[PDB]
Amino acid sequence: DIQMTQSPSSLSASVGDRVTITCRASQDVGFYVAWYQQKPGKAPKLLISWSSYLYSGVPSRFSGSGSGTDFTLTISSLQPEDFATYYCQQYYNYPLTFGQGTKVEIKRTVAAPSVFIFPPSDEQLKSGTASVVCLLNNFYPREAKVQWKVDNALQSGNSQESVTEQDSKDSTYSLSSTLTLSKADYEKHKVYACEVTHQGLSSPVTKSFNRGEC
Amino acid sequence: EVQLVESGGGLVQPGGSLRLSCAASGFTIGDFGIHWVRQAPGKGLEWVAGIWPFGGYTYYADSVKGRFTISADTSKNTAYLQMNSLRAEDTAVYYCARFVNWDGDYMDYWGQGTLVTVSSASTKGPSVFPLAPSSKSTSGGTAALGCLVKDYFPEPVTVSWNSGALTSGVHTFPAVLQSSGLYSLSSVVTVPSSSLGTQTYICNVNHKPSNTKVDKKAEPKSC
Amino acid sequence: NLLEDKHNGKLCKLRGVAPLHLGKCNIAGWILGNPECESLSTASSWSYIVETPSSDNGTCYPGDFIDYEELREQLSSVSSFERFEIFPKTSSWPNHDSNKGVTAACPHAGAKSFYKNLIWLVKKGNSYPKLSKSYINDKGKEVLVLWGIHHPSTSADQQSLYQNADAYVFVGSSRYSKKFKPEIAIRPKVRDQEGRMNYYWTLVEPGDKITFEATGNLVVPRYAFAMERNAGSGIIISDTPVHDCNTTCQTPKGAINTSLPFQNIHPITIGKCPKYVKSTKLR
């Protein structure tokens, strides 16, 4: 049976630009190819039927081509909404095969984070646990480095980040880094700093807080 | 309005069994046919099952032969994927999609997806705490406040802020797994000082796989 | 006796394989299954085809055959060729109407009728929902497949027949790809028909899939043809009869029992035929 190799596996390109996504079938299919855009989470949507023919949505810049063994989906004037992931399907025979996808990333003008740092409060210190969260909000590019420091002792191998999906409106990421120590370890230090080494900060920007209600 | 609303997925014990329906508002069923395509996160889409009702025929992918079976009630507009002997590879987002040429077509409409999760066991809720803001007001100690939805199993949680009243600025993050094997995500929403203690904020944290319903409140400092 | 200016005045065979004789029909009539050719659907294999110069029963409904001369050539020299029901009337158009469509243009004896090998899909009640049937060449030879696009004259005509003005047809294979838009427009009657209908045709590789998709205006295939090409022949336009005889050259005027170098008879010829010029005597 058949398999649908894509190229590249993901792509960076600024607004206005010609994105091109090629797809190599393993058997000579013919025009029995479709293209799907799927905005992460939600259910995929059909772009091109029959190799070239724009499906009746509002997809004017998206346009198919190709034949035989290799098919190409172009995007002539890219948008903040084309951030999604793109697959070629076949229906020449079964099992019906898709590619792995191509993740087209939008480039845009660099913006710095609104950095924050957050203590626990209520039931979290009631658990023999403690989790401090180091928030970034609407920065670009993705490549950041939030780094925890307790007093001035540098951390390692216990926090965990989560980078949200890029925005279809302005193309920025909000990040959060959740640092988890036991409450046997929490109160034994007084200062928790979280620093942010970032491409759009001419020098690093740390926010800290000293465990202090009393 | 064309519709493929899919229902009845969740957590289950390995070597197990769950039926998963794909129902249809708007249109009929028999003259069309339905395909089950699933998506184990990060791979990309994979076709598993297909049915042509008017024809009466069904065909299956190599990888789910003999376990899953597609039925369809003409009386109820609905089609059903019976999933036997489930595995960790079958833990996925399953999509039914509308289809016409039994010789091989494309997908006019998909539903929205159902989440199926199958490994070990757990039927646990989430604890919800606040992520306390600091300093003063916007540009020089801004008010960014939130709820940490730590320790539960499995996905998802519908973390809707005040019935989704201010769904602008929000970032309900991608969950992550700790040593325990329990999903944890943070929630955040940005706002200046004219909506600080001046505003009320609940997070309607909605983990449904064991319907825990925490309306925890992240307010100003308590002293 | 070592030259030739004579013809037998007949149309003999070639490799002891007789011509396909179309009678009053032309090629298009014959392949589309014109009703006035029903007597020649059972034609089993042949050397060369014979139209007549007044073979007027062809495309009884008006409009263009696309690549007619290409299809003419394709059919001229042919060994063993066989008609089959590609998309059965029984099972292939379940939710479109499969008999409402006949016309005054294509009549078999004072009765509205239509082509044998094609079938004119009309709407079933209130809707022409998308069809999308496909055929797999499970025959191990060039399957010839023909179909039609219909082009009504009024916008009302469209609703009446196919319901949807947003109508298209698509045909697709590993060698063919076309979308058809119905060009709906008022026209001078031809055979009491303001509408028109264009006939197209394609060959399908063995193993290959061919698929029809349509929201309207499709004249779907019913009967297609598994054929094996031959070569070194064409179509000859004569009035002289066929006979039960052997030859190794043929011309519209007649046959040539030839061992010899040239001829004065007719320039278009078939098989082991001398060149045309003028050749009568050698003392």
Residue numbers in the entry:
A (entry chain Q): 1 to 214
B (entry chain P): 1 to 223
C (entry chain A): 31 to 313
Lines from the paper:
In this work, using the 2009 pandemic IAV H1N1 A/California/07/2009 (H1N1 CA/09 in short) as a model system, we demonstrate that neutralizing antibodies against pandemic IAV hemagglutinin (HA) can be rapidly attained from phage-displayed synthetic antibody libraries, which are designed with antibody bioinformatics and constructed with recombinant methodologies. To fully exploit the advantages of the phage display methodology, we have developed phage-displayed synthetic scFv libraries, for which the scFv variants are stably folded with the CDR sequences encoding amino acid residues with high propensities for protein recognitions.
